[PDB]
Design an enzyme around this catalytic site. Structure first.
Site, short mmCIF file in Angstrom:
data_model
loop_
_atom_site.label_atom_id
_atom_site.label_comp_id
_atom_site.label_asym_id
_atom_site.label_seq_id
_atom_site.Cartn_x
_atom_site.Cartn_y
_atom_site.Cartn_z
N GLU A 20 0.83 -1.14 -0.06
CA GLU A 20 -0.21 -0.42 0.16
C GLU A 20 0.88 1.19 -0.19
OE1 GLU A 20 -3.90 0.52 2.38
OE2 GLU A 20 -3.55 2.62 2.00
N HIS A 62 -0.20 4.61 -0.27
CA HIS A 62 -1.49 5.21 -0.32
C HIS A 62 -0.62 6.78 0.44
CE1 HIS A 62 -5.48 6.15 0.92
NE2 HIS A 62 -5.80 6.97 0.52
N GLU A 100 -5.15 0.53 -2.34
CA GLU A 100 -4.50 1.94 -2.39
C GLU A 100 -3.46 2.75 -2.54
OE1 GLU A 100 -6.30 2.77 1.18
OE2 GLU A 100 -7.65 4.15 0.74
N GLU A 149 -14.33 -2.99 0.43
CA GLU A 149 -15.25 -2.22 1.35
C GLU A 149 -16.13 -1.47 0.83
OE1 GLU A 149 -11.47 0.73 2.62
OE2 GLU A 149 -10.40 -1.14 1.75
N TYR A 150 -16.66 -1.91 1.91
CA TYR A 150 -18.19 -0.91 2.10
C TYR A 150 -18.91 -1.06 3.29
CZ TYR A 150 -21.51 -4.98 2.53
OH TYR A 150 -22.04 -5.91 2.54
N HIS A 188 -18.94 1.47 5.91
CA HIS A 188 -17.72 1.67 6.99
C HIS A 188 -18.26 2.31 8.53
CE1 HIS A 188 -14.18 4.16 8.00
NE2 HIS A 188 -13.66 3.87 7.92
N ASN A 220 -1.36 11.82 13.97
CA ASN A 220 -1.99 11.27 14.30
C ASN A 220 -3.23 11.12 13.78
OD1 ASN A 220 -4.29 11.69 16.49
ND2 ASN A 220 -2.65 12.47 17.33
NA NA Z 1 -9.65 3.58 9.42
#
Ligand code: NA
Ligand code: NA
Ligand code: NA
Ligand code: NA
Lengths: 412, 206
Positions: B5, B7, B50, B126-127, B129, B186
């Site tokens: 990844e 991203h 990603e 992914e769906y 959330h 963060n």
């Molecule tokens: Na997250």
């Protein structure tokens, strides 16, 4: 019943133009066009015989071609000695569409080689290309959005006799209410209708005069090869009559006759004889082998209607079924019977969101009411069994966006 | 799924479109397939997550298809329907609403299936959330999955909250997120997207 269209005498010379086809071919940006005119004669072939085809825009002659008879070699026996095909180049042709109905005039002169005219015929030419490419119906390279309506030939006083004044009134009201297309439900119309659609700008679905809806099952005749010659004349004589009209963009095999093998045969006939226009046909489930377009009637936007052999999927779902790639254009939707057209905005939201949902044809344009007269002379609009006619289906003939006198319903 | 990844790169495919990083990415894919190819539970390989769409993805897609034809390959990056995936596998595409981002649009999953030339099945990688009080509208997805044959489901984000335990001065444990360890910069509570708490007690969305 009766003699409900025109009756005419036509005098031709013995050596005559017997048929002519006009095709238009384009480059990929439509900046150069070739007009291909195929002319057929009947009568004595003489070596002095010539055909000139001239193309005119308004008053300026744009393209001309002169050739004796004699086609190119077709097979082992040769070619047609009684035909000649002229190709005229047109640079930056004004393209035809419903938005801008640019028309040229083609003149086909049969004349001797020393220049004596025998007979002329002519037709309006619209330069446009209709094609389905990558699942979309394109007109001049652009995906169409069909704002259509079904239109019967109906007059409340004259019945099924059409006149130019009613045709022009319908076309004007249609264009004034943002329709760009009309389906000839369900037969070839009066010949003037296609001329007026050429000149005002409407896309036309020209439909064969074949509906066998009352049969059980619906394809009992259309799957019978004994009825293939009768059905073949309803399709082939329509294409031979109307193939030069630019407003006709799609051929239809008819309406509500199930799906039989005769449909598949006549589909393929039209595709061989006239590849310039898609063929559609709703019957037998709207997505058979006899149609280039998924053309259901009254499929809903979001709700499936899972009938046993002819289901009406939701039009969004129908597009993504496995192996389905065609565009979807409802041949009938939004049944305008009386106080209706509820949920019409849901269709047009779906048409704008989904690329292969390319619109549809509202059922339908004009109420099929007829005028009767009360005992004091006052006319009134009659439907179904108001003439002693039984069995009848009452007010179901009135499904129009406009009344039979062409006054608009509120749904319009 | 391969351990790839990228991203935070700008753009996302800055490494995955670079052939200098093709040997490093190739080991993350090939060593995963060599390790796990006998497991029957593994039904789909993923090229990672990603990392945009680069030519290294297309190469490693084709590698897996040559070495192990028994499993489809999917990869969401670069718009969920690239040449590097056998499955349209978007993240958080909605059921009915398009999200028309400029080069990587998230079409509505019903619309995505019927785009011209699109024939693959669609399974959301992914769906829904599940961040906190969430999974609203979850039934709309499952209505769509049952109605449409090529909508073959998806993977909820995600199973378990990534909270960690810290201890107060009296010894009582408490669930910590993001910058509760002095870790900056963060992203706070965004690590907790689970259907269950980190101790595996269910959220109400489950
Ligand atoms: Na997250
Ligand atoms: Na559309
Ligand atoms: Na009716
Ligand atoms: Na499904």
């Amino acid at each position: 019943s009766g003699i409900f269209r025109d009756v005419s005498l036509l005098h031709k010379p013995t050596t005559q133009i017997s048929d002519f086809h006009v095709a238009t071919r384009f480059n990929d940006d439509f900046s150069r066009a070739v007009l291909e005119a195929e002319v057929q004669m009947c009568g004595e072939l003489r070596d002095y015989l010539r055909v000139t085809v001239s193309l005119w825009q308004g008053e300026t002659q744009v393209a001309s071609g002169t050739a004796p008879f004699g086609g190119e070699i077709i097979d082992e026996r040769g070619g047609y000695a009684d035909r000649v095909t002229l190709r005229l180049n047109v640079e930056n042709p004004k393209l035809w569409s419903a938005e801008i109905p640019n028309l040229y005039r083609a003149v086909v002169e049969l004349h001797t080689a020393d220049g004596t005219l025998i007979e002329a015929e002519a037709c309006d030419v619209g330069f446009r290309e209709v094609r389905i490419e990558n699942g979309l119906l394109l007109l001049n390279g652009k995906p169409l959005l069909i704002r259509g309506v079904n239109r019967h030939e109906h007059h409340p006083l004259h019945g099924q006799v059409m006149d130019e004044q009613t045709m022009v009134q319908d076309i004007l009201l249609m264009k004034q209410n943002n329709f760009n297309a009309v389906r000839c439900s369900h037969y070839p119309n009066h010949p003037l209708w296609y001329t007026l659609c050429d000149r005002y700008g409407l896309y036309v679905v020209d439909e064969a005069n074949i509906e066998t809806h009352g049969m059980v099952p619906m394809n009992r005749l259309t799957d019978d090869p004994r009825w293939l010659p009768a059905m073949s004349e309803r399709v082939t004589r329509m294409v031979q009559r109307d193939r030069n009209h630019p407003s006709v963009i799609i051929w239809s095999l008819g309406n509500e006759s199930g799906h039989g093998a005769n449909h598949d045969a006549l589909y393929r006939w039209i595709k061989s004889v006239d590849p310039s226009r898609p063929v559609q046909y709703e019957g037998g489930g709207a997505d058979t082998t006899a149609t280039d377009i998924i053309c259901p009637m009254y499929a809903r936007v979001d709700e499936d209607q899972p009938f046993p052999a002819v289901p009406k999927w939701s039009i969004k779902k129908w597009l993504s079924l496995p192996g389905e790639t065609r565009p979807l254009i409802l041949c009938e939707y939004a049944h305008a019977m009386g106080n209706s057209l509820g949920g019409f905005a849901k269709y047009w939201q779906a048409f704008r969101q989904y690329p292969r949902l390319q619109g549809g044809f509202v059922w339908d344009w004009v109420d099929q009411s007829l005028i009767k007269y009360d005992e004091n002379g006052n006319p009134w609009s009659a439907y179904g069994g108001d003439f002693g006619d039984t069995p009848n289906d009452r007010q179901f003939c009135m499904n129009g966006l406009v009344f039979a006198d062409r006054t608009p319903h509120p749904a319009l």
